[PDB]
Amino acid sequence: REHWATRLGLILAMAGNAVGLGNFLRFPVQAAENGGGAFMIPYIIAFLLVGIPLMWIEWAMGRYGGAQGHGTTPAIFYLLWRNRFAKILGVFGLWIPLVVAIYYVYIESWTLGFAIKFLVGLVPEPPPTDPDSILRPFKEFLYSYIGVPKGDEPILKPSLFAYIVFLITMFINVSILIRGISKGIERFAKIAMPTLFILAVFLVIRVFLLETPNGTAADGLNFLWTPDFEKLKDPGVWIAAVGQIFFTLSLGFGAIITYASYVRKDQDIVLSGLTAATLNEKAEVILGGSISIPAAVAFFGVANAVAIAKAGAFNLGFITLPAIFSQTAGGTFLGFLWFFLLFFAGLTSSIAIMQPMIAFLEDELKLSRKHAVLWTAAIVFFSAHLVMFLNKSLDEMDFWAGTIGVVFFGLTELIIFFWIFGADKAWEEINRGGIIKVPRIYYYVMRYITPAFLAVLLVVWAREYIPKIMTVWITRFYIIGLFLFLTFLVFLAERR
């Protein structure tokens, strides 16, 4: 079985798995929509009670399975719980990263295409002192690239350039993935993560220098770090906080498990997972939180920044921030750096979510690495046409697979590992070979606090939020077919 070549490379590949678009696009939106600093008290709490324990649990399950040649949750759930229903529940660990990949690589292609056009200077030229006169050209720029209808008709018409960039992005993902774990993902992570850090630091420094008559970036930093204890009672704040922790840490996507399956049987996983989780949080709260919101607040004020963030997740990243840059010296090249930062973040994360499907085809169906990568590329590329041309299909996939799915699967893996497989056996497997050992209190957090926390979250989410959500049926129909297809592939694997 393949294994990570170096200790540093494993850490940077796991950091590249965690540090993604969610750090710079989803997190600023989630923070601004939920009270700014009010979002930060539950966030930190969730990171301590859910993020860190589930990270260690997914690392342990990955390495345990990889020691037996299984990097995917169907086989791993069966090894932890010899039952056919465990294999069915494992199918979710292939279904989530596939559906997430279908729209995540497409969003990644957006960043690459915007990076290209901004580098070449093919950007709108707003008239040099109206907020709408500056925002509207970039709103049309994004709407033309993805093909947003001027009305609400549910058909999208992406530009030919966007489609070509999507093919190029799929090609780039394949070129990295086809070279394996050590010579592909690891070697590229060693390059992308320093590039990602440097770009983020330069953007943070440049944003800190922004001052307009409406405020400064310091006001955005204040808003982000001003506590609001009156929101701690709101369940919606905790739902967003835990969902953001799940998303940003790649928990419940099956990616951490698959990556950890290439960690050697005796190599450390406690400090490694802790370092990767800490690197992700530094990138998120320090770097991600200091670019979008501070620049937005500096130009528009705290009032309009929150309103723009409420306009959607893409508005802050693809319309507002490029427009704000368009009013500063050289801001087009600054916008290029922003989208290039986003692209490397998306790329290091997209290779991670597509590795589970690759690992299943390699481990269980005995396909070659080339054919596993190429067939995974085919399934993702083909299925992506649904997201490309059917309006609001991307949102439905992110809800079922990337939002409810990850929390349900996180509770599922925790219960299989710490309740069915054995709390003491799981604790021994987590701490085995660790350069440091997990604090004793976390044993009770993993056994009682985390599953009770996640169970209450899911119950609240089901009773209070999902009935309202219940052409979206086309997307539901298709992703159900994807689950049946993976179920059939699991059936073929066990029959072999």
Question: Using CB under 6 A as the criterion, which residues of the chain lie in contact with ligand MET when the complex forms?
Answer: 18, 20-23, 104, 247-248, 250, 253, 255, 349-350, 352-353
* Site for Na ion contains 451 (CB under 5 A): no
Cα–Cα nearest to 14, from 270, 265, 244: 270
SS3 215: strand
CA 99 to chain centre: 12
- Our finding on whether 348 is near Na ion (CB under 5 A) is yes
Q: How far is the CB of 430 from ligand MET (least distance, A)?
A: 21
Residues with Cβ < 8 Å from 306, sequence gap 6 or more?
32, 33, 36
Report the nearest approach of ligand MET to the CB of residue 193 (Å).
14
- Beta carbon nearer to ligand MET, 169 or 248: 248
**Interface mask toward Na ion for 326-345; x: CB under 5 A:** -------------------x
Q: How far is CA 269 from the centre of its chain?
A: 21
355 binds Na ion (CB under 5 A): no
What residues contact residue 84 under an 8 Å CB cut-off, 6+ apart? none
Binding residue (CB under 5 A) for Na ion from 16, 71, 331, 356: 16
Instruction: Identify which range of 37-45, 202-210, 349-357, 448-456 contacts Na ion by CB under 5 A.
Output: 349-357
State the nearest-atom distance from the C-beta of 355 to Na ion, in Å.
12
| Closest residue to ligand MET, based on beta-carbon distance | 20
Task: Report what 353 binds from ligand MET, Na ion, none; CB cut-off 5-8 Å by kind.
Answer: ligand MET
Number of C-alpha atoms within 13 angstroms, CB side, residue 150? 1
Instruction: Report whether 26 belongs to an annotated binding site.
Output: no
* Greatest Cα-to-Cα distance within the chain, rounded to the nearest angstrom: 69
Minimum distance, C-beta of residue 281 to Na ion, in the bound complex (Å): 9
CA dihedral 456, 457, 462, 467 (to 10 degrees): 140
292's tokens: 């979008």
CB of 421 to ligand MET, least distance (A): 25
- DSSP class of residue 211 equals E
Q: Is residue 270 a contact point for Na ion (CB under 5 A)?
A: no
Phi, psi values for residue 392, rounded to 5°: 65, 10
Task: Return d(Cα 31, Cα 21) in angstroms, integer.
Answer: 15
Question: Residues at the annotated binding site?
Answer: 84
Name the binding residues for phosphocholine.
Answer: 84
Binding residues for Na ion, rule: CB under 5 A, are 16, 18, 20, 22-23, 248, 345, 348-349
